[PDB]
Design a protein around this ligand. Structure first.
Ligand SMILES: *C(=O)CCCCCCCCCCCCC
Ligand SMILES: *C(=O)CCCCCCCCCCCCC
Lengths: 60, 300, 300
């Protein structure tokens, strides 16, 4: 977050494993793997997208 | 079998008792520092995730990132636990509401508010019985130039008052159960006068906690305060509370979440400000029972 | 590091080997009574719930009452097991079909046939990945004066042939996946000649197992026979079989259930008899993964 110190807010970061309609709304993103980021408290935020696949490896 | 014991005395000798009957019910009633600031019964006073011995708050794939924690409370000092002797139960974020200079307050009911949340909701309607605890995370940020205070109350068996003055206990199942949507508080009682075709719904007056008791005393209930000055979020850890070990989630709501402006929202100088309040709730240590065909309610 | 070993000899001396390369792939190929009636590799021959060491058959609230059991088989000698290193998974009874003097046969696919079965189906569509084994219980009774024989075949990766002779591998997802309903076999190949607006579906010829191979050899697959004379039901215990530990249940069907009249239904003297065949199937040792918003397929 490269905004100002006086700025505050909460964002939701999400990861949805394949097989359904790609999320167009918070309501559905909410349902998958997610993190809630508080901008005001800390400037940066990390989310790990854990390896979840049917196949052993994926193609490039 | 005569029972001898110390008499209830002043502070400057005893009495005798014999039980005449076989059933204990027949028995007479058996009658039973340094720092004043300390609570006699802490748990009755709203402890912290900290204060009983228990940041990234995570359930299944869902996860809260929280510094705020002295701002948490474990209802009745009791942590959620399995009916003793699952990733349908995770964090669900409900539709965000808006706090304004004229909001009187908001209410929700559990499990009701979660009835349509993914596999949780499904599990609820496919089973006769279900039990669950909850983690309620209220989110509400503003600037250092904004001001206001939210009172977040978790009420056990939160029965609310109805709109009618001609008939009682008459709020319809549909109206009593708003789902995620919410349900809201009002500043004044407005009796549903339409006799013939009744509204059949609640009329919750704010200063009376929508139930005939004074809001100022709502703090005897598991609660937490969001003071815009000091903190932007509150976390309530709620145990399964009931007169039963397990019950019908469809017929009965265990907990009520009430959010009221203890101190009105204000900003810099704008005549009419606004800020969002988002509720993220997760069911805990949860379990279901008595599987069969699905319940299809007439919610309308 | 020279490796010396016994030469492949007749029956009335050895050779030497050295590996020149770092990758095993580079390596040369390394080449490796009393009662004849005994099987070299039994498991490849369709064992019983009995024959590997393993009546009321029960899963969750669901339960089969069975004397019939010598009539059971554990596919590939392998019992269902958890992806190692739940009462959504129980017995579901599908829509009953009717066996007549002219039926050519029936087919179903797993998980597909179970896609709408209570919480199982839900779990399937809310997750990216899922795996499961199955207990297939085929039910079909008649009288001591009826006759006939059903061949119940469990086929791994049961790819079926299509209706077109102008284009290949073109059966639509919708048509390939019938759900519980079924899908049926035919006595003759009828090429979908409608060029412009293609039927895009399977055309499964019975004597060719709907896949280009002779039905008479279908017995190399995990199977069981219902001979109306001797037994009225068959039970197949199916393991999760795949080139992967877990996969997409929505994109891919693991097992195929094929039921064909090895010997035609006949009764007393009625020119046209009928008897019901009911399939009750239960998912086993089952597990799901990668929860998110629900999959809403275009099944039509
Ligand atoms: C223990 O109780 C033994 C001593 C009992 C004293 C005997 C006199 C009690 C008279 C009342 C007993 C009959 C009441 C059912
Ligand atoms: C074990 O291998 C030690 C004895 C090896 C015999 C030496 C002659 C082998 C010549 C081939 C080695 C070079 C091939 C990469």
């Amino acid at each position: 977050f490269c905004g100002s110190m006086m700025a505050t807010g909460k964002l939701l970061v999400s990861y949805a494993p394949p097989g359904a309609d790609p999320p167009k709304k918070r309501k559905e993103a909410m349902l998958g793997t997610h993190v809630i980021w508080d901008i005001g408290l800390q400037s940066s935020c990390t989310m790990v997208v854990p390896w979840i696949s049917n196949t052993t490896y994926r193609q490039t | 079998g005569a029972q001898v014991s110390s008499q209830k005395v002043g502070a400057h000798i005893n009495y005798t008792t014999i039980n005449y009957y076989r059933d204990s019910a027949s028995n007479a009633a058996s009658k039973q520092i340094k720092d004043v600031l300390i609570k006699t019964a802490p748990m009755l006073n709203s402890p912290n995730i900290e204060a009983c011995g228990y940041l990234q708050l995570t359930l299944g794939n869902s996860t809260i990132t929280t510094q705020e924690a002295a701002n948490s409370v474990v209802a009745y000092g009791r942590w959620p636990e399995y009916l003793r002797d699952v990733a349908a139960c995770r964090f669900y974020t409900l539709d965000t509401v808006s706090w304004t200079k004229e909001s009187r307050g908001w209410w929700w009911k559990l499990p009701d508010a979660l009835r349509d949340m993914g596999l949780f909701g499904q599990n609820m309607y496919y089973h006769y019985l279900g039990r669950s605890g909850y983690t309620v995370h209220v989110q509400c940020n503003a600037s250092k130039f904004h001001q206001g205070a939210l009172g977040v109350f978790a009420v056990p068996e939160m029965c609310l008052a109805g709109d009618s003055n001609t008939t009682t206990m008459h709020t319809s199942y549909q109206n009593a159960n708003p789902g995620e949507k919410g349900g809201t508080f009002t500043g004044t009682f407005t009796p549903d006068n339409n006799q013939t075709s009744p509204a059949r719904r609640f009329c919750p007056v704010d200063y009376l906690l929508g139930n005939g008791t004074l809001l100022g005393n709502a703090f005897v209930f598991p609660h937490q305060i969001i003071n815009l000055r000091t903190n932007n979020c509150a976390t309530l850890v709620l145990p399964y509370v009931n007169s039963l070990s397990i019950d019908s989630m469809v017929k009965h709501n265990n907990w009520g979440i009430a959010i009221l402006p203890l101190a009105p929202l204000n900003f810099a100088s704008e005549s009419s400000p606004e800020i969002p309040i988002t509720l993220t709730i997760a069911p805990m240590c949860c379990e279901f029972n008595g599987l069969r065909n699905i319940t299809l309610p007439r919610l309308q």
